[PDB]
Amino acid sequence: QQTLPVAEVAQNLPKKGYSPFGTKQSSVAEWSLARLDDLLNWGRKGSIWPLTFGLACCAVEMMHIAAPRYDMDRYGVVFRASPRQADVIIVAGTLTNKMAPALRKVYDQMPEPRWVISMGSCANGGGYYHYSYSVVRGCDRIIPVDIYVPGCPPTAEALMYGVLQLQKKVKRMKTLQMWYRK
Amino acid sequence: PRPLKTTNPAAMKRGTGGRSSFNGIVATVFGATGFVGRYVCNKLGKSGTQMILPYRGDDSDVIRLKVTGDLGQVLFHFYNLEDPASIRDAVKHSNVVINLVGRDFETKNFKFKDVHVNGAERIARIAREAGVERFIHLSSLNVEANPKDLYVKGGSEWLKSKYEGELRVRDAFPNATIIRPADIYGSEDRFLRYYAHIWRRQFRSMPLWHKGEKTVKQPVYVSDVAQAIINAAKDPDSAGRIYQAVGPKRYQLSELVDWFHRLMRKDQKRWGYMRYDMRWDPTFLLKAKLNSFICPGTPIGGLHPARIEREAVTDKVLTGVPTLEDLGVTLTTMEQQVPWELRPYRAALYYDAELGEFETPSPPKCIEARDELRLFA
Amino acid sequence: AVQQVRPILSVDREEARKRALNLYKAWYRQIPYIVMDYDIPMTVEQCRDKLREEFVKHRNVTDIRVIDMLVIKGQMELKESVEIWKQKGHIMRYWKESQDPKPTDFLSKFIQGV
Amino acid sequence: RGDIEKVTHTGQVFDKEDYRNARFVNAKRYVNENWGIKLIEEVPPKECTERVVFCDGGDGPLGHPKVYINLDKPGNHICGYCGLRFVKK
Amino acid sequence: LTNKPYSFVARPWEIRKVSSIDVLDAVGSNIVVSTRTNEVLRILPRENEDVNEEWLADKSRFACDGLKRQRLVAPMVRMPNGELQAVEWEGALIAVAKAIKAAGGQIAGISGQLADLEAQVALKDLLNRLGSEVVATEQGFIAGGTDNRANYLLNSTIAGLEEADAVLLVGTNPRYEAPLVNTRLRKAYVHNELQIASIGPKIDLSYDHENLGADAALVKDVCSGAHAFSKVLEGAKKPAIIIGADLLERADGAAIHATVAEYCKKLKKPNWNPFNVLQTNAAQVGALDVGYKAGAQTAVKAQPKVLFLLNADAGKVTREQLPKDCFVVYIGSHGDNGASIADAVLPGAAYTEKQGIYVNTEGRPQQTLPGVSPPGMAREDWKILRALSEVVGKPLPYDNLDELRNRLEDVAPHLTRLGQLEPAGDAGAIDIKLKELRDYFMTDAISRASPTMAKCISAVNKQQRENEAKQ
């Protein structure tokens, strides 16, 4: 595994910079799109609206992320009810067969760009009920998953770390910069 | 007796065929994000195939395919069509390569020369170097050495490139399979939507070339085409041959469009549907010309002069070239599928009709072989 | 080899035959509603065949109590389909569309493997 | 890269023609470098005088169960759990 | 004390137990093959008073390594240059089918050592559909012996021997040929006060026994009553005569089989059948019971243009003895000398991956069960022959095992009644192989491929080398 740089070696490395695309763009047009691409990502990154799914006993720890101790809202994360206004879905709990068509539909109704987070073992791979006769073995069978948060339930910080991974994943989208090459 | 390429047991067919099975096929679907790709990839995922899905754009578009397969059976690989070093990485372990790369229009970075003939050659040439056993390519059915225009002065460029791309493919990868579909449809398509879109109309109308009465088509359901691609992939007998992917019945373009607007409840009696002759109104050609210019990413409503020329040309299914029936596919008729395709495009869909308040539409009338002789004089 | 038992719904095969036909009525009446209220590819004629095809599955059944149970379960689905508690997916579950044909001939199975 | 062809301590590696290397084109194959078979071999044996000795993994309740070893034979004797070697001379 | 080859491989609770039978030896000892995640870990003895007795000879116990080496995985075909290449099934069966049509009826088959009854029957039917009738086995035997089922069985059941009182061993070292029988003789010797004698080379049986000498004429002497031991057999209340199946195969065998089979009728006592033939292959009894001819020379003498070696990995057949125009098709599990000559190798499944009927020496039909899936593209032995008829055009009457079993039910009704025996009533210089322990381990393809049995051979040789060195 790639280990972190030592202090002395890191003592020379240049400051990272904010944009993951750097300021090394050859042309003006490319550079403007790169900077303009950051503006989109800065927007979507800032305000990520979950859907308030809350299926099973991960759902309780999905409340304590909104509790004052950790305060999801500090990061611009605001819970919402309608899937139209919701941007992210946190599938937290055991997605049984009876639910499975309902999650698919609710996910479909969510407008793009939509990212899915899988909370806990139940939604990751079927978890403790993996072999049950009425459990979908992981929600990735039904909807694409963008971040997997392990745990049972994941700690509140663990989910917070998951959300920040989604911000970083959002931060590095190349929606515009890849249109130029296309 | 075809030699077995590798006897390593881990790389042999195993299991009942479900998602956890394995076909011994390691495919690489170039252009899996497109319309056809969604259906090819899913059919592969059912069998147990391991697929690499190269994608040029942002991962967001292709991430939805991860659901198609099973764990570790779907892998993405960013690549640039011009850079061969990128492509080699995605074809250095494959047994099958499928080339669904193409466009209905040109771009600022990719003219039809770069995509259909130069691009497809590069994928095929690199594949031969790596040692891919099988290869599959797509091309239009009406492909011709020099196709004459019918209504647009430059509407035949797309077919010209497709023909030329077909030859270079056979040049680089001599035992490549070629499947020649014609007017694929069935969802997220550009045939049943290109005729249901607002742009295509003129406030309620439908400018069709000759009212569509001199155009005959054999549309094929996309799933049947995808089944053909996979069946051709499982069989070595199908290598190095041309296949024509056409439906079971032939319809006049006027006959089809009437039937849609009956299914869509957009009948002339109430809705106000009516068919121009496209030659009479020059406003329509301006819309495409304006539409192509204005939109940077993709034409709206699939409307642009290149697409117009596709509509005008009547399908020319050659005699003696194998069809998907040779590959064992059982073609779905339009009557089976289309009435379910157009349910979300129906007009006055907010009604909550009582049972029987909308009468079932009459089916379309195919065109007999003899009638085509008379229809064309 | 006979035993005394408690009847389920009916006392005679003729009454059982009578109940089963009613279940065919109610389904055959209901197909036009199911097509409208479910976004599924199948048409009335196709479905009306599926009703015929499956009532034929239980062709050799003889015991009245077994026929009662089939009619109890058979009726339960109809109420769950007369209502739209069953979702779009469940209705099409009667066709097994996703599962592709498995050849039956020996030579094909052998080549395909177990 | 290098890691693909590296052979793990358990002795497994994908053949250069095996397709399963495809999974590593966009990821890495961590092969642990601290092979236990060599580190334990490095530690020298412990000379004893008594006829039987015990090893508990070295830290009592944090080690492994206490096992006794008999040193009558000439060859240095390995502990079942920790792998340490003992010898009487 | 614990199994060294099996060391640390798994734990009991993990194991899924699969009751089966052994085939490396003719005794047909019951077995419990321990399986975990599609692999045979070990083999254990299943209790069965009548046959197994909870014991188990080593060759059965340590054949589980042989099933993981030198195994055939894919169909292979001789290219025009001379090498073998792996090919798909559809290609292979079609390639073999060309030979069959071009052969034009001059077909022959040779059952092997590990062959299966159900696979053997398919091989017979397939060759009959083509009209051919040269269906033999590898072991030779007395001509005309298949007429009576008592002529090739332990008419005194395995359990029945432990009551024996006077036993005559003619050209048989049961300590190695079939140890589980010897374990019963020693039980009689300890408890029932058994008197034993031998005719053949001097050996050790793990108990005192007289050696009458290796001369051929001895057997006629004992039968004639003139010999001293002849008094012992005629006085005992449960005499028995055991003759090795190897000797019967010898040229003299027919006369020897006649005298003792004639002599037993004098010794025959109410509910006791003295005559006893000791078999060494699980395939042999089943083959003779179905209608096979005996001896691999029954196939060479036909000069066939196509030959089927069904698990026939003995070196009895050689590519020289075949006509220069021949097509050898080997259907087996382990690539061995049998495959080394073959022109088209079709992989089969070993006994742990195929449900098959075997007939042990005493006549008990018993059923294996598949504990492990066959590896690679291997398939069951009879499935191939059933499939091979399609590409030749004469489909067999059956397409499932139960359909195949009923075909056996028509040829021989007793073969269906598993775990049972039907008494067969009356029966109508000697040198031996397999006299040393060194020769005990390497006798079968599975055993010959075993890494463990290589260690045992080296270990026995190692001690002998050191022993003479010190002296």
Ligand SMILES: NC(=O)C1=CN([C@@H]2O[C@H](COP(=O)(O)OP(=O)(O)OC[C@H]3O[C@@H](n4cnc5c(N)ncnc54)[C@H](OP(=O)(O)O)[C@@H]3O)[C@@H](O)[C@H]2O)C=CC1
């Ligand atoms: N009506 C039909 O569809 C018929 C089928 N065909 C041919 O079948 C093929 C696939 O059909 P269809 O799904 O409808 O086509 P689509 O336009 O729907 O999708 C084409 C795919 O190819 C990719 N693509 C296009 N240009 C490039 C490029 N320069 N570099 C890399 N990738 C590129 C696209 O990736 P991305 O979108 O991410 O940029 C996309 O995934 C087409 O080539 C078509 O010509 C021929 C006749 C009729």
Ligand code: SF4
């Ligand atoms: S993963 Fe654990 S905590 Fe989360 S819903 Fe399942 S059982 Fe409850």
Ligand SMILES: [Zn+2]
């Ligand atoms: Zn220790």
